[PDB]
Write a protein that binds this ligand. Structure first.
Ligand SMILES: CN(CCN1C[C@H](CCCNC(=N)N)N(CCCC2CCCCC2)C1=N)CCn1ccnc1N
Ligand SMILES: NC1=NC[C@H](Cc2ccccc2)N1
Length: 342
């Protein structure tokens, strides 16, 4: 009786039919489906997180943020399907707009025109402006978290690693463990930052811009410290100004121990790129997070002037935990999903 898909249970009630397997990957399993009430095809993601406290924490964060945000460039939650009781609730199904591809899949197979790069970048920054205006950090921006439909609308997804910004509590020691995807990590993550300031998102967007220009990751480090050495290989040795900002001795002395390296010019790395795009790239991939361009300045950059319109770049109406045993986490997920029950 319950709907089955390639061997596993995927019972999304009577409303969602004609399921088609889309993917998997620890985060449960995704299928497209038909929404008999709105008669559009939707995407449905099955989540089975309750067996691990980390999965429940990320599930709760994503649900709470996505339910509060409302923005054209941020994926919404259309519906949440779960059992009527906490005892019977083993999985949760998240219903979202159906998006045909993501930037990761697209960069694997397609070359982007400069007009596409410009428009995709504009929508990323437009969505990020709203996120940061809510005092939220995404913390895992990368091509696979940017969804695209057939008319080139872009929507940011996957807020499971998000945090509320906390700049006064950002400092930490050298080579401190971190969770977000290595290739998109800002250099200060490896040096002295917990990733609690808005500048770590801007770095990631700069990495995404570089990748849209070349179809390959600009800093493809194979391990934690290898990441920093890739960044320094292109940006060159940090200046005295930038090093005086790093007061932790272990991090400072690591950088001082390296042979001097000169900056590789962006136009050597991206010889086909719009020069205005490379000027913005340079400002987003600035070593010093305090000198790095902010989202509202990036939107106002000449590269984006055919789209820039601050009156059409909305902000959140209000600014926006992690110690809970999985049982009250399940209880919190149950409460947060109650509004979708019949
Ligand atoms: C030749 N124009 C660019 C073309 N565009 C695009 C834009 C509409 C895009 C819709 N996008 C959306 N999301 N709805 N618009 C009206 C927005 C006013 C601007 C200019 C004054 C300051 C506030 C922003 C334009 N005139 C250059 C303008 N200009 C001069 C100095 N600096 C800039 N940007
Ligand atoms: N403003 C604006 N609405 C639609 C159109 C989208 C687009 C897509 C690819 C390349 C350029 C532009 N542009």
């Amino acid at each position: 009786g319950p709907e089955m898909v390639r061997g596993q249970v995927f019972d999304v009630g009577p409303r969602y039919t004609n399921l088609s397997y889309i993917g998997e990957g620890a985060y449960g399993m995704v299928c497209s489906a038909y929404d008999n009430l709105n008669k559009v095809r939707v995407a449905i993601k099955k989540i089975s997180p309750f067996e691990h406290q980390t999965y429940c924490q990320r599930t709760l964060r994503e649900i709470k943020i996505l339910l509060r945000f409302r923005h054209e460039n941020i994926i919404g939650i259309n519906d949440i399907i779960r059992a009527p009781t906490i005892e019977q609730m083993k999985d949760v199904y998240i219903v979202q707009d159906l998006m045909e591809t993501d930037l990761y899949k697209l960069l694997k197979t397609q070359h982007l025109s400069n007009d596409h790069i410009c428009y995709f970048l504009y929508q990323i920054l437009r969505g990020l402006k709203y996120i940061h205006s809510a005092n939220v950090l995404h913390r895992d921006l990368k091509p696979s978290n940017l969804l695209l439909n057939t008319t080139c609308d872009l929507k940011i997804c996957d807020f499971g690693l998000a945090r509320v910004a906390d700049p006064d509590h950002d400092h930490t020691g050298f080579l401190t463990e971190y969770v977000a995807t290595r290739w998109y990590r800002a250099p200060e993550i490896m040096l002295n930052s917990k990733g609690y300031t808005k500048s770590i998102d801007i770095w990631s967007v700069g990495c995404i811009l570089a990748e849209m220009l070349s179809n390959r990751p600009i800093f493809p480090g194979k391990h934690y410290l290898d990441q920093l050495n890739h960044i320094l290989g292109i940006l060159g040795s940090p200046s005295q100004e930038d090093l005086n900002c790093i007061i932790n001795l272990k991090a400072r002395n690591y950088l001082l121990s390296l042979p001097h390296k000169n900056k590789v010019p962006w136009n050597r790395l991206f010889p086909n790129a719009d020069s205005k795009a490379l000027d913005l790239l340079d400002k987003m991939l600035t070593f010093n997070p305090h000198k790095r361009i902010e989202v509202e300045q990036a939107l106002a950059h000449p590269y984006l002037e055919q789209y820039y319109d601050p009156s059409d770049e909305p902000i959140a109406e209000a600014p926006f935990l992690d110690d809970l045993p999985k049982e009250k986490l399940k209880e919190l997920i149950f409460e947060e999903t109650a509004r979708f029950q019949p």
